[PDB]
Amino acid sequence: MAIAHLATEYVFSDFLGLRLELAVDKMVTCIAVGLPLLLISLAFAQEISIGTQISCFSPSSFSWRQAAFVDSYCWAAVQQKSSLQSESGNLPLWLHKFFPYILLLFAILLYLPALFWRFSAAPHLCSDLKFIMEELDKVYNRAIKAYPIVEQYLKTKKNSSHLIMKYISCRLVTFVVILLACIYLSYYFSLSSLSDEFLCSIKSGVLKNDSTIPDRFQCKLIAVGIFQLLSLINLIVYALLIPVVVYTFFIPFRQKTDILKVYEILPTFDVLHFKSEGYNDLSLYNLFLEENISELKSYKCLKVLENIKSPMLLLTNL
């Protein structure tokens, strides 16, 4: 089941013609979220394979339940600064017990912006998108017959900047989460190098009275190799993933040829040389325009027409 389920559940599943996001952001997100969940789920599956994460020695004189009792004690004694000791410094190792669950938290944290952004952004864009493709169908209907309201709309998007700010800030937060994850992994990995062993004592007051108990036990953390191994893998990917966010911004140097110029071929269109040298909603609309153009059939025809430029029968043949 499990691996075949994961083949469906991670590998096949897409849900993890209008497009309300640029796909790469979903792809980045699906990658970004999917790998740790996989890493988490694999670690959890390895827990099921191995069992448990820790032990102290115990004398052979200690009975079966006494050994169980003691090991759970030390496993509990973990919580208290005084009751266990390792010279590597107890608190971060105490954090080592915490560490697996924080991984899950990190995975959760990355999901939180994505879900919120889905609800925040989807309705405004969809209506806009449906409107804009309808405008080209109207132009197409004008071509059948054979103001720039959407431009006037677009010039308002050059005046407006309200919603695009919402997008940008959402990018930074998730990125910051990634930074902190990368940092967190780095911090953990670095100490993970030597934090393997710790001593226990169980000598709470009655246990303190029990002269049979040795004063300390030698004890070790076993999942650390998995932790350190898994941490490295995801960190490397994420180190590369941060530059991906950077490309989203680089729009005006990226705008070396204009999408509007392909519409400019239409007599229904005008000198929309709308290079957003000032950053404005227009740049968002330009990006989603070419994104949504990936749906638009006629734009390929316009490219063919542009390639032919590189007519009415052609238009008719459309």
**Three-state secondary structure readout of 166-217:** HHHHHHHHHHHHHHHHHHHHHHHHHHHCCCCEEEECCCCHHHHHCCCCCCCE
Gap between the Cα atoms of 50 and 223, Å rounded: 10
Of the candidate residues 18, 22, 28, 62, the single one contacting a second copy (CB under 8 A): 62
Residue 68 lies near a second copy (rule: CB under 8 A)? yes
Gap between the Cα atoms of 42 and 5, Å rounded: 13
Of the candidate residues 176, 179, 183, 222, the single one contacting a second copy (CB under 8 A): 222
DSSP state of 46: H
Write out the binding residues for a second copy, residues 233-292 only, by CB under 8 A.
Answer: none
Can you give the C-alpha Rg of the chain in angstroms? 30
Gap between the Cα atoms of 299 and 259, Å rounded: 10
Gap between the Cα atoms of 254 and 279, Å rounded: 13
Of the candidate residues 81, 89, 131, 267, the single one contacting a second copy (CB under 8 A): 131
DSSP, collapsed to helix, strand or coil, labels residue 55 as strand
**Strand runs labelled E in the chain:** 54-56, 84-85, 197-200, 217-221
Write out the binding residues for a second copy, residues 27-56 only, by CB under 8 A.
Answer: 27, 37-38, 40-42, 44, 47-52, 55-56
Residue 314 lies near a second copy (rule: CB under 8 A)? yes
Residue 312 lies near a second copy (rule: CB under 8 A)? no
Write out the binding residues for a second copy, residues 90-109 only, by CB under 8 A.
Answer: 97-98, 101, 104, 107-108
Of the candidate residues 273, 277, 310, 312, the single one contacting a second copy (CB under 8 A): 310
Residue 196 lies near a second copy (rule: CB under 8 A)? yes
Residue 204 lies near a second copy (rule: CB under 8 A)? yes
Q: Which residue has the tokens 């924080």?
A: 102
Gap between the Cα atoms of 13 and 205, Å rounded: 56
Residue 294 lies near a second copy (rule: CB under 8 A)? yes
Nearer to a second copy, 58 or 276 (CB): 58
Share in percent of the chain as helix, strand, coil (round to 5): 70, 5, 25
Minimum distance of a second copy from residue 206's CB (angstroms): 4
Nearer to a second copy, 165 or 194 (CB): 194
Q: Kindly indicate which of the ranges 12-20, 168-176, 251-259, 278-286 contains the residues binding a second copy, using the contact rule CB under 8 A.
A: 12-20
Beta bridge partners of 217: 200
Nearer to a second copy, 66 or 255 (CB): 66
Backbone angles phi, psi at 196, to 5 degrees: -75, -35
Of the candidate residues 162, 256, 297, 312, the single one contacting a second copy (CB under 8 A): 297
Residue 301 lies near a second copy (rule: CB under 8 A)? yes
Of the candidate residues 64, 162, 256, 257, the single one contacting a second copy (CB under 8 A): 64
Residue 190 lies near a second copy (rule: CB under 8 A)? no
Nearer to a second copy, 107 or 260 (CB): 107
Closest CA to 281 of 166, 173, 175, 195: 166
Residue 162 lies near a second copy (rule: CB under 8 A)? no
Residue 11 lies near a second copy (rule: CB under 8 A)? yes
